[PDB]
Design a protein around this ligand. Structure first.
Ligand code: NAG
Lengths: 37, 388
């Protein structure tokens, strides 16, 4: 289906936050377009 | 045998920087070499250990505002996509911020060079290390082991983390080219290197930052002037033009050859089915002027284990830059050049000739010219020619 196809070409997890050792936790300040994830 | 390019530790170490299956170990054109679990789903992850010089992702958005066709633009907000309509506007850049509004990306090299956590010795290494030191959080806000790829902009001195790890999107059932078909959510995109544009961009997996000084001695970062890559067979160095599966094309410039080592249809790639190339592919090539004065490009999948001297040639790889000289942003704050590894002195490095290869009627000659090792195939002696 579309989820398997997107995953096979590198489609990334639906993530709202990342942690970086310099900045700490960092998050989207507004909802990211859904289709992007 | 008696391959001069395998003759001693230092020479072997030097030639090993060209083996993209050894250190890089993943796809080049598309790098998706690893799989990582986030929230119970497995995702593909860029994994290669070498930076890919000049690599950028070219987008096919409509040619109009608000579309900039630039992968380094922030990923689109849901409100932006509502305003643009299809396809998705914006680019691949991670737009996240700390609570006070500091952006993770792009991040200024000027801050990385004065930070105690950042240990890398070069600016490229510091960008790569910043990427390595960034991990996705899952739906429970726990760190995972999934890491986004990065692009270093060495012109602006900015470190980008890409929220989009996809590198190739194609097929009219999934993506539009310049807004056609207009119903599709995604625009098409693909990796590119260009004869003129974006040489200052360097794309890599976050895993380039895992051991962030390693790429300096283990990756073929720069083009190699003055030599054609070859393989050692029947007692002599055969450059790619002597190999059957070699692809040879006329080109108008050396730069076009560099672009072909990355763009040709056999380059190591992990793109679908989830292939893991492991860095195996037609990743190697050289520009040369043939005996009749035509500029040509020879491309091969054979990892080089010797070199043929040719002052008008330049050997490239899919990973490395067009540049033939070490740029300032990869010189440690504190690894021998080709000139150093290939150095000789005439009175310490006598001419040697190997045995006639009677199939080609040629023999190896290894000598010192201009303080540098020469390696060529020359005619056999008169008696030897009897045996041909
Ligand atoms: C390239 O590296 C691969 C794996 O490390 C190795 O098996 C192969 O021998 C190397 N090729 C050389 C040195 O020509």
């Amino acid at each position: 289906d579309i989820v398997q196809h997107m995953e096979d070409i590198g489609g990334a997890p639906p993530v709202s936050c990342v942690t970086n050792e310099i900045l700490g936790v960092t998050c989207a300040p507004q909802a990211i377009a859904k289709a992007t994830x | 045998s008696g391959n001069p390019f395998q003759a001693n530790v230092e020479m072997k170490t030097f030639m090993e920087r060209f083996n993209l299956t050894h250190h890089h170990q993943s796809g080049i054109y598309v790098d998706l070499g690893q799989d990582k679990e986030v929230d119970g789903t497995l995702y593909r992850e860029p994994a290669g250990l070498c930076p890919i010089w000049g690599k950028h992702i070219e987008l096919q958005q409509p040619d109009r505002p608000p579309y900039r066709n630039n992968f380094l633009e922030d990923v689109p907000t849901e409100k932006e996509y509502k305003q643009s309509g299809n396809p998705l506007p914006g680019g691949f850049n991670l737009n996240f911020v700390t609570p006070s509004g500091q952006r993770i990306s792009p991040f200024p090299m000027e801050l990385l060079e004065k930070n105690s956590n950042i240990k890398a010795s070069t600016d490229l290494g510091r960008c790569a290390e910043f990427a390595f030191k960034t991990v996705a959080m899952d739906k429970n806000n726990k760190a995972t082991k999934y890491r986004y790829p990065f692009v270093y902009d060495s012109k602006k001195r900015l470190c980008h983390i890409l929220y989009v790890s996809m590198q190739l999107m194609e097929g009219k059932k999934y993506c539009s080219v310049k807004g056609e078909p207009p119903d599709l959510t995604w625009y098409c995109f693909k990796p590119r290197k260009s004869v003129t544009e974006n040489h200052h961009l360097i794309y890599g997996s976050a895993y380039v930052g895992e051991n962030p000084d390693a790429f300096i001695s283990k990756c073929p970062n720069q083009a190699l002037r003055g030599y054609r890559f070859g393989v050692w067979k029947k007692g002599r160095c055969l450059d790619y033009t002597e190999l059957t599966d070699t692809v040879i094309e006329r080109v108008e410039s050396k730069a076009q050859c560099w672009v072909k080592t990355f763009e040709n249809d056999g380059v190591a790639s992990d793109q679908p089915d989830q292939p893991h190339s492991g860095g195996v592919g037609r990743n190697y090539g050289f520009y040369y002027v043939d005996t009749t004065g035509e500029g040509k490009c020879a491309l091969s999948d054979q990892v080089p284990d010797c070199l043929v001297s040719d002052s008008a040639a330049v050997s490239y790889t899919a990973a490395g830059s067009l540049s033939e000289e070490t740029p300032n942003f990869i010189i440690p704050s504190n690894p021998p050049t080709p000139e150093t590894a290939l150095q000789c002195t005439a009175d310490k490095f006598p001419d040697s000739f190997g045995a006639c290869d009677v199939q080609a009627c040629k023999r190896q000659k290894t000598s010192c010219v201009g303080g540098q090792i020469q390696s060529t195939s020359v005619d056999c002696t008169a008696d030897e020619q009897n045996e041909c």
